[PDB]
């Protein structure tokens, strides 16, 4: 992830949006990417969008816990399922 950060820090962020937009909208290609091209990644604060007046995002992180790394391609074969 750091060797990817040398190349472009914005790509480290774009890889993860793709993983949350492809968390439901994988089915058809049009809706797989059309959201992705709605966010604007900037490795620093300066950005051309004062003319759009981006309203701040009143949001505090919910999980104080850390991020586990779960392999894409991890298969959960059986779930707690009441019928056991």
């Amino acid at each position: 992830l750091s060797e990817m950060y040398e190349r472009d820090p914005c790509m480290v962020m774009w890889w993860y949006l793709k993983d949350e937009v492809n968390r439901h909208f994988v089915r058809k290609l049009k809706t797989r990417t059309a959201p992705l091209e709605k966010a604007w990644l900037y490795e620093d604060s300066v950005h051309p969008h004062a003319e759009k007046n981006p309203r701040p995002l009143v949001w505090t992180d919910t999980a104080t816990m850390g991020w586990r790394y779960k392999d894409p391609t991890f298969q959960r074969r059986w779930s707690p399922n009441q019928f056991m």
């Binding site: 968390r23 439901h24 994988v26 089915r27 949001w59 505090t60 919910t62 298969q75 074969r77």
Partner: protein, 49 residues
């Protein structure tokens, strides 16, 4: 095996407002307080009878 569940899971709760009541505004599983602590904005206008 099965299809992956691609539904829309609900999002986790926002943080409650700071306490500044001293009424034990912090307590979660108490009889008095409904879970939601949403004293947002022009809620005083929503004056209920």
């Amino acid at each position: 095996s099965s299809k992956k569940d691609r539904t829309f899971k609900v999002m986790p709760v926002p943080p409650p407002p700071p306490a500044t009541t001293a009424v034990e505004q912090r307590d979660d599983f108490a009889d008095n307080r409904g879970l939601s602590a949403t004293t947002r904005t022009l809620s005083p206008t929503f004056r209920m009878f």
